Ligand binder design. Structure first.
Ligand code: ADP
Ligand code: ADP
Ligand code: MG
Lengths: 432, 49, 436, 48, 48, 119
């Protein structure tokens, strides 16, 4: 069937294609060429996995179509889902709700994962009888398939039971430490054959085993999630709405201290991750200045960046800098350069894309498409793969031929041909 | 002290968003935010399975 | 659509079974190559396996880019989500531009859910809670086809008491959720008082138990906004939140991923179907550099829809930049990621065909000489001006007592109204008098 | 000491045949909100 | 059992089967979703 | 306007109030909102009160002067008995602007309900 995840621009990439010595294979895990860049990415990946060093920045720079986002997706895939990988674009830090520096702080704190581990004793059973004498004192009877006992209730326990409207036949769990009662379900009897059911009622089997049980919960949360939880009274709602605002720095310092205390106590573990900012040249000079000192914290993730700009103008200034990035930040980061692909590399990438899309192409078609990709662009050839597959299927064919590629080349124009045709009729278009 | 403004509208307007139950699906099967503060990890992971 | 819009005559791309474009079909005249390209794009959208592919329709104004997009939408059908947006709609005062773009992206992705709904509806003849607390609720519902006794979950009693449900009221109960709506009193009790402020409703006609199997389409954005804020809630904070002004919020990527997981679960179960759909961005040149940069990332997602752009600009300045010019107002990096469909200008014969089609769509009879004069006017000034002259000319014909447009009516309308070029000439001849 | 020159009740929405459930729901919501919040508004009595 | 009717009992047992199927489907539907965070995680992460 | 002689709730609970002045006595039945306002003003038997029927504004002015001798330290402000009638009607000229009416009808605060305070 068709799931929500479909063939995208980087669906064929499963990893960086390296061996145990971080030597890149020519074509492994869906990546072709970029040997030096892939080796550098693997070194950075080992640095991320060790987690010892904080606030390391790497910039993937190169011409468009040279595999920068491909390398970033390969790094994300090779890194486990356990380790956080926050991928944002440069334009996403311009928010109407929070400042640019707040957006960058939240992006930094989303990239550090905290794995928590709480062990809690609970009582779990089906309610048999609740007798309350008069809201002063009462008794509660709970049962399993192998056990049954009666409990003496106090004032607060009676109030909590009356508030939750616990009745007979309900399967509930009670936390011994805090006394909070959550209802799991109700048992099914012959008399409970309802014709209409409430939105929260559900029928479950009576629990087996022993009435007293230990509950172990292990989950991975980020620092930003703890900040949002502790920002306001019902801050967990902002984890859905996103209406977080600007969290106070004192709250962040308290949460860092508390997380360190948990890590010392053994109740939590830190998993530093990666923050990938794609098209960083969109960041303003203020954002770069903030990044300069944000990476210097002991709770800063690895900052991977990718730009395709030459010596251009920094946003918010009139200065020219080699990547659109001020040289002060560029001195804080290692630059990984991507080289343009050759004819063989382009053909191998086209083969991988065809395999991903399940398209059969003749060798002459591959030669023509590789020539087109060298002449126009690699992405144009990749799109022509699917266009030619569709056209071939339209004429009830099974293998894409050169005629199909020529047909889709005539139907769909690249940038150069469109620009030429526009220049031919320049006066027709508006605001030249 | 002034009397309030009495704004009169068509009775059909107040039923514009209303959809009959036989004409709409149950949106509670996608309710993730409603589970917060009410459903625990124990129930979802260990008990119900 | 009773009223006639600008593209009310576009019924499809007009292709044949081989994908080739007929000269005049489905309300489209000419643009054969563009129509064939749009047919290939429609075949791409139907074959749901591709995500994030983007298409640009580039050509001079009035060449039919919007008409081609609407023809694509008609060819797909109402079952595929076609979300039309204008590039200037991203400048919201509540959320950032990237949030608007992602919301539209999620709007384009559709989810089809097949479900059988059960509702118990009828006049209440008995409402008896059974004490053991309340073990269950016994209700008696009456319809024209009989009476049914129902055992209710005790949680529904709170809903029944809140709605103030008594004997003689017409209610419905949802089997899956227990929701109760008291939709008035039965009209058999309308005479129980001479003056009560009650809404009396006829007794339902069918059975008490009504079953309907329905297929409803929802988009991912609907689930996102459904999970952005809580609903209901008897707590004080929830109630005070109900009074708060509803404002669009920057929905988190965590919530997006969780909703994607839920959708995948229901797809695997077999109760959901995915319809990738199409997002059409018109006047894309109104986007600034930040929007284009974000589109670079958004289009590369494995979850994004097919996006169709349209631009009539030539070599113009990108909106967010100082002096950077690009071929269509679109950065070369985004142009590298799109397949460009080129629309050409129309010959006089094609213009006459389009004018005739517009006349037929607007219910206007036009003579051959009037049509030829209109075509000459369109060649002189613009196709849009000639199309816009049909209805006023028909009105003058109707006033004069004629059921058809003659040449004199077209001449009179051309005298009454001016096109852009004539008005600009008048303005240039009287520069001093007009405001600067 | 500053008093508004004019004081008016909120605009009221009137329909000939409204949904018979809207008004009871609004009344219940207002009643619950008043019962929960009016005791907390007593300190502002002198200001009002 | 002189007044026994086979059709009435067949209808009643079909109704009982439908009711049981509805109970099963609703019980499965009302506990299918797992929380994004959960009560335990939120309680652990919530400082005083 | 008068001294309160009887404050009897009538079950939402209405109030039956008895007011006396130097000219007479009158018993009135008032809305539950007025009863809530009287409770907020802490009006008890013997207090001089002012009620504006148009706005439902209840002001407690003080304990009546006749009780100013009972104690030596009561922590009360005493006010003389009203010398007119219990029920008065006064016609006055109000100077308002169109903007004032627009503001009063756009951010209403005349209902004295919880929703007005919330808004
Ligand atoms: N080394 C590679 N192996 C496989 N595919 C690649 C490689 N480099 C680039 N591509 C493909 O080329 C397309 C554009 O490259 P990408 O890295 O996404 O953007 P850019 O390099 O221009 O920043 C992607 O769809 C990607 O799959
Ligand atoms: N090839 C065509 N066939 C039929 N109608 C057309 C064609 N091209 C344009 N039109 C009509 O002309 C009008 C203006 O065209 P429009 O779609 O606005 O062009 P653009 O989008 O380039 O401005 C539309 O109402 C459209 O229906
Ligand atoms: Mg890239």
């Amino acid at each position: 069937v068709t799931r929500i995840e479909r063939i995208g621009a980087h669906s064929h990439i499963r990893g960086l294609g390296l061996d145990d010595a971080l030597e890149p294979r020519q074509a492994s895990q869906g990546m072709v060429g970029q040997l030096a860049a892939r080796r550098a990415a693997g070194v950075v990946l080992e640095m991320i996995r060790e987690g010892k060093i904080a606030g390391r920045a790497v910039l993937i720079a190169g011409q468009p179509g040279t595999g920068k986002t491909a390398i970033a997706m390969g790094m994300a895939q090779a890194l486990g889902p356990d380790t956080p990988f926050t991928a944002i674009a440069g334009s996403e830090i311009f928010s109407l709700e929070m400042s640019k520096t707040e957006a960058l702080t939240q992006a930094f704190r989303r990239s550090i994962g905290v794995r928590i581990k709480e062990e809690t004793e609970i009582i779990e059973g089906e309610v048999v009888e609740i007798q309350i004498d008069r809201s002063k004192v009462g008794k509660l009877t709970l049962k399993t398939t192998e056990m049954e006992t009666i409990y003496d209730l106090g004032t607060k326990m009676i109030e909590s039971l009356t508030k939750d409207k616990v009745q007979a036949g309900d399967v509930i769990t009670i936390d011994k430490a805090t006394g909070k009662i959550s209802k799991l379900g109700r048992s099914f009897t012959r008399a409970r054959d309802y014709d209409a059911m409430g939105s929260q009622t559900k029928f479950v089997q009576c629990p087996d085993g022993e009435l007293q049980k230990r509950k172990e919960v292990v989950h991975t949360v980020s620092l930003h999630e703890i900040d949002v939880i502790n920002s306001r009274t019902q801050g967990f709602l902002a984890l859905f709405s996103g209406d977080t605002g600007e969290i106070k720095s004192e709250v962040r310092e308290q949460i860092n201290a508390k997380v360190a205390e948990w890590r010392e106590e053994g109740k939590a573990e830190i998993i530093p991750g990666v923050l990938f900012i794609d098209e960083v040249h969109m960041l303003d000079i203020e954002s770069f200045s903030f990044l300069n000192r944000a990476l210097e914290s002991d709770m800063a993730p690895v900052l991977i960046m990718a730009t395709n700009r030459g010596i251009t103008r920094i946003r918010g200034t009139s200065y020219q800098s080699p990547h659109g990035i001020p040289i002060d930040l560029l001195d804080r980061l290692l630059i990984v350069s991507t080289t343009p692909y050759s004819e063989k590399d382009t053909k191998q990438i086209l083969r991988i894309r065809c395999e991903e899309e399940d398209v059969e192409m003749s060798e002459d078609a591959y030669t023509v498409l590789t020539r087109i990709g060298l002449e126009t662009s690699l992405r144009y050839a990749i799109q022509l793969i699917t266009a030619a597959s569709l056209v071939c299927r339209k004429r009830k064919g099974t293998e894409v031929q050169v005629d199909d590629i020529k047909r889709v080349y005539s139907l769909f124009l690249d940038e150069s041909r469109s620009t030429q045709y526009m220049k031919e009729y320049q006066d027709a278009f508006l605001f030249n | 002290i002034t009397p309030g403004i009495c704004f009169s509208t068509a009775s059909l307007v107040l039923r514009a968003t209303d959809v009959h139950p036989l004409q709409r699906i149950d949106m509670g099967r996608f309710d993730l935010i409603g589970l917060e503060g009410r459903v625990s990890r124990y129930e979802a992971d260990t008990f119900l399975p | 659509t009773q009223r006639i819009a600008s593209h009310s005559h576009v019924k499809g791309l007009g292709l044949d079974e081989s994908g080739l474009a007929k000269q005049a079909a489905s309300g489209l005249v000419g643009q054969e190559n563009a129509r064939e390209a749009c047919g290939v794009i429609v075949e791409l959208i139907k074959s749901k396996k591709m995500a994030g592919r983007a298409v640009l329709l580039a050509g001079p104004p009035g060449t039919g880019k919007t008409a081609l997009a609407l023809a694509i939408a008609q060819e797909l059908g109402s079952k595929v989500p076609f979300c039309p947006m204008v590039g200037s709609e991203v400048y919201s005062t509540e959320i950032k531009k990237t949030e608007v773009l992602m919301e539209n992206f999620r709007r384009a992705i559709g989810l089809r859910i097949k479900e059988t709904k059960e509702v118990y509806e009828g006049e209440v003849t008995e409402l008896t809670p059974c004490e053991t607390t309340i073990s269950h609720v016994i209700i008696g519902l009456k319809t024209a086809k009989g009476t049914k006794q129902l055992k209710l979950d005790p949680s529904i009693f709170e809903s029944l008491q809140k709605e103030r449900v008594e004997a003689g009221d017409v209610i419905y109960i949802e089997a899956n959720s227990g929701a109760v709506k008291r939709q008035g009193r039965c009209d058999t009790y309308a005479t129980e008082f001479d003056l009560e402020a009650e809404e009396y409703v006829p007794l339902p006609k069918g059975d008490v138990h009504k079953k309907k199997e329905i297929i409803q389409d929802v988009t991912l954005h609907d689930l996102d906004v459904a999970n952005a804020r809580p609903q209901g809630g008897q707590d004080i904070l929830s109630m005070m939140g109900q009074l708060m002004k509803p404002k669009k919020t920057e929905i988190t990527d965590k919530l997006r991923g969780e909703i994607n997981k839920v959708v995948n679960k229901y797809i695997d179960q077999g109760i959901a179907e995915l319809v990738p759909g199409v997002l059409f961005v018109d006047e894309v040149h109104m986007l600034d550099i930040e929007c284009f940069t974000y589109l670079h990332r958004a289009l590369e997602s494995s979850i994004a829809p097919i996006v169709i752009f349209a631009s009539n600009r030539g070599n113009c300045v990108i909106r967010g930049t100082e002096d950077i010019t690009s071929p269509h107002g679109i950065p070369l990096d985004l142009l590298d990621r799109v397949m460009i469909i080129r629309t050409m200008l129309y010959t006089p014969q094609e213009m006459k065909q389009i004018i005739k089609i517009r006349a037929q769509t607007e219910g206007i009879n036009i003579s051959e000489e009037a049509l030829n004069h209109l075509g000459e006017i369109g060649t002189k000034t613009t196709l849009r001006y000639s199309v816009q002259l049909l209805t006023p000319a028909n009105l003058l014909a109707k006033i004069n007592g004629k059921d058809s447009i003659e040449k004199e009516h077209v001449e009179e309308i051309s005298e009454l109204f001016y096109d852009a070029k004539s008005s600009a000439k008048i303005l240039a001849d009287q520069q001093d008098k007009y405001m600067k | 000491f500053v008093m508004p020159p004019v004081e008016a009740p909120p605009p009221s929405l009137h329909a000939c045949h409204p949904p018979p459930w809207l008004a009871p729901r609004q009344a219940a919501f207002q009643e619950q909100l008043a019962s929960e919040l009016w005791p907390r508004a007593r300190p502002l009595h002198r200001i009002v | 059992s002189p007044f026994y009717l086979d059709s009435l009992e067949e209808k009643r047992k079909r109704q009982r089967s439908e009711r049981l199927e509805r109970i099963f489907q609703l019980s499965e539907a009302h506990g299918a979703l797992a929380p994004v965070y959960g009560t335990e995680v939120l309680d652990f992460c919530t400082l005083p």
